[PDB]
Design a protein around this ligand. Structure first.
Ligand SMILES: [Zn+2]
Lengths: 50, 84, 58, 154, 62
RNA sequence: AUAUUGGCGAGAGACCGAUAGCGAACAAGUACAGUGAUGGAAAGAUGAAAAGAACUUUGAAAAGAGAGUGAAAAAGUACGUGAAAUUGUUGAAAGGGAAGGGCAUUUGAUCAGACA
RNA sequence: CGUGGAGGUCAGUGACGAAGCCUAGACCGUAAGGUCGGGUCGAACGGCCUCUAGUGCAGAUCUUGGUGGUAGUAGCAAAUAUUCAAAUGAGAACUUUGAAGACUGAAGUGGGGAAAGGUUCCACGUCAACAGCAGUUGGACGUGGGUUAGUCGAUCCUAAGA
RNA sequence: GUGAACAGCCUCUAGUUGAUAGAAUAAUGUAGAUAAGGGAAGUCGGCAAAAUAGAUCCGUAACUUCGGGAUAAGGAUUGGC
RNA sequence: AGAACUGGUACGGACAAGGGGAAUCUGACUGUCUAAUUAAAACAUAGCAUUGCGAUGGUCAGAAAGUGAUGUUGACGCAAU
RNA sequence: CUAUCUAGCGAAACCACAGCCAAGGGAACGGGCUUGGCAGAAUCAGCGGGGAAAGAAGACCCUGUUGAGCUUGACUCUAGU
């Protein structure tokens, strides 16, 4: 909520910095098997239960 | 209604984050994590939760200190500057 | 004064905007290709309610 | 690219193709079979009349429960429809094919569309939500199209 | 173009509603650069944005 | 002397060979569900080498067609081969409220061995 | 008869193309099945004497995966209601501006907040997917910016209680 | 504003003008309505619907735990200037 | 509150807004319950009556305890019906 | 407002194979068999006879050396006292 706690604002910040796609220069490395970011998250679909 | 109407009223938690396992198990009215009873010194581990032990036992983390012990034993728990 | 943009960072680190557009669209394609399978292999065992009451007696 | 069953000389033919399109396969097949063996000019005049709601498209296989009309009488059938989305993709590929035929050096006056076919494509899935807390699929029927024109002879 | 922002800013500037705000259609190309909120005041003053008057409610009959 | 499905290091198998074998050959106790205890997946292979399609042209663009790389795009990142169900085009044939099947032969196609 | 592996053997086949797959093309056998030609494909595989077994499927309201007829069908009908011109655009029933008609009608379709959610706020660019029609738009895609307290709150007190 | 009234109906400030659309107007339906004469003959049964309805005046029974019944029943009036 | 005058006898003109009466069975009443087939004559209720208990106690709990509820209590009370 | 026609979008139950009747016999009520009547592409809206239509329908009887809830002076025990 608005009147929240720092223990939760921390965990929301982490989720904000995690919510991005994959860097395209990872796909150019040699023995690469990562196509996309399979751990993505958005508020519509999956709630992080904290 | 016991279903769709009575699922609107689910807006106040009973579990919060534990400091010991980091997951939403810390009950608030009784103050006892349901995965590793936090105020209690012993972590919950029952032999019937044999899968649950896999998820929380040794190896499942970093092993900051422990993973150098086999290295330090192989050499004799030794000391000092190496060599020339 | 703004001597930096994310496009410029990724240009410095290899990828051009053409490469970025194409590789992005492929990563979008694959997500949908997988979501297809998750919606495909689920419709079977998703309506398997444990306690349906069947509102029909008389 | 490998195309379907084509009995023509490749030198007097020009090809086109459209893959992974989000039209209905069932309507596009009828739209495609309504112009097989035709000349490009008459086909392009016909497909525009359709959008103007004249000279309908006959529905012959995928025709169950649809409505009847009077623009089927020039084909014998009494069931027909005016599928704009399919018509538009088909017009695009006819354009592309005529361009390719021009670039290969063929005369548009006497081209005819020899081999046209549509295929099924991979579905695209969504959920619809029914009564009693159950899900069912709601998915499209996309289509590949491939097309060949070639110039007439004896 | 799209002036859905400029309308909102005009309201908040003028101190009036989003529905009493008139953007000149012949100056979309001028308004669309008014991203700022000073550049809305400049236009209000030029007359390219206008505050419309109250939809009258009259008390003569009562 | 004895025990040892755990831990560390090693050596091997008439074992499994990606619906198998540990649940996991892959960012697997991961994603995800659930208030919680707990539950718990799927997913391997281009090619020797990206040489991952310069350039032209139609299209608003995706793309298409040529061109090109390659031993091979009947390998084009939806990529080893690429079955079947199911489907489209072409060709052959048949068809009065089913179809299929057994015995016998005509007609059409096809094969034969040629005793050369 | 057939299958996966094991021991021997044919100094076995094979990149001049192994296996696999397709073949109303052929031969052998009562049959299980074997053999050949062609097409495709690209790296290992068979015959004989024996050993061994996680060894042969039409079924189990079988398991997993995939797919169909139904079927371009049922249907996308609650919440009084949309219309004109221009602009942008490849493209406008649905975007934007203006003009008109209307509604909520102050126990509101307003303005703010508690829980809860977590950056959904705002801007620029953008429309493959989503918005069960469409889409140039968007709570979506991508990139960034953004929350300023001696006085508001927590913090402090105790309640039922732990 | 009406009105006893935060009712219902209409408007001001603010907000929205969102819910897939066009054409046509068969049957059967959903929701809403009307109906000759008769008036529950229908039906398990007056289910459903209709009638009444506000305010002022008059008048209001049995019975009663004397407090009620009771808006009993039943009659009349209602505008504008 | 009253009187004239007036109108296609209209006028709480839209909205809004009770159908009434005579008798029986039953429960006294207001109230509560079968969330998602039973709202009732069932449950509760005040009222009446009984029973136990004068604290080293009556009723009840706990695995046990230097342990507990009634009890911050004391028969005009607690407990059980 | 739907249905109906059109543009776009676009599922599901169910499905041995499938779908014209009469009589016969038969697991005693045939879509298929037998003997007959007949039989001409492809079809639209409706319909509710049939498909012994479909479904996580209701109860009725029985068996089981299968159970569970509850009661009692069933059998065997037990906390407490
Ligand atoms: Zn914990």
């Amino acid at each position: 909520a608005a009147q929240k706690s720092f223990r939760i604002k921390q965990k929301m910040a982490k989720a904000k910095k995690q919510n991005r796609p994959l860097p395209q220069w990872i796909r150019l490395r040699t023995n690469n098997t990562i196509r996309y970011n399979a751990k993505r998250r958005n508020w519509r679909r999956t709630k992080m239960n904290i | 209604g016991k279903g769709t109407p009575s699922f609107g009223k689910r807006h106040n938690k009973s579990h919060t984050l534990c400091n010991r396992c980091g997951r939403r198990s810390f009950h608030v009215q009784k103050k006892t994590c349901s995965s590793c009873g936090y105020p209690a010194a012993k972590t919950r581990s029952y032999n019937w939760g044999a899968k649950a032990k896999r998820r929380h036992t040794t190896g499942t983390g970093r092993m900051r200190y422990l993973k150098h012990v086999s290295r330090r034993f192989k050499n004799g728990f030794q000391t000092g500057s190496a060599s020339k | 004064r703004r001597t930096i943009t994310a496009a410029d960072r990724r240009m410095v680190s290899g990828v051009t905007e053409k490469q970025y557009k194409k590789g992005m669209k492929k990563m979008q394609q694959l997500e949908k290709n997988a979501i297809n399978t998750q919606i495909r292999r689920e419709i079977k065992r998703v309506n398997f309610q444990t306690h349906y009451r069947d509102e029909l007696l008389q | 690219a490998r195309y379907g069953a084509t009995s023509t000389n490749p030198a007097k033919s020009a090809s086109a193709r459209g893959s992974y399109l989000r039209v209905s396969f069932k309507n596009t097949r009828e739209t495609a079979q309504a112009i097989n063996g035709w000349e490009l000019t008459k086909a392009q005049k016909y497909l525009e009349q359709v959008l103007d709601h004249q000279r309908a498209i006959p529905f012959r296989r995928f025709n169950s429960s649809i409505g009847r009309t009077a623009q089927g009488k020039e084909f014998g059938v009494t069931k027909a429809r005016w599928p704009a989305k399919s018509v538009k993709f088909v017009q695009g590929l006819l354009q592309n094919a005529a361009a390719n035929a021009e670039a290969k050096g063929l005369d548009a006056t006497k081209l005819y569309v020899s081999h046209i076919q549509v295929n099924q494509a991979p579905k695209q899935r969504r959920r619809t939500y029914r009564a009693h807390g159950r899900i069912n699929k709601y998915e499209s029927s996309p289509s590949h199209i491939e097309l060949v024109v070639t110039e007439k002879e004896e | 173009a799209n002036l859905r922002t400029q309308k909102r800013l005009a309201a908040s500037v003028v101190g009036v509603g989003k529905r009493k705000v008139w953007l000149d259609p012949n100056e979309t190309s001028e308004i669309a650069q008014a991203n700022s909120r000073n550049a809305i005041r400049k236009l209000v003053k030029n007359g390219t944005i206008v505050k419309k008057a109250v939809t009258v409610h009259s008390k003569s009959r009562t």
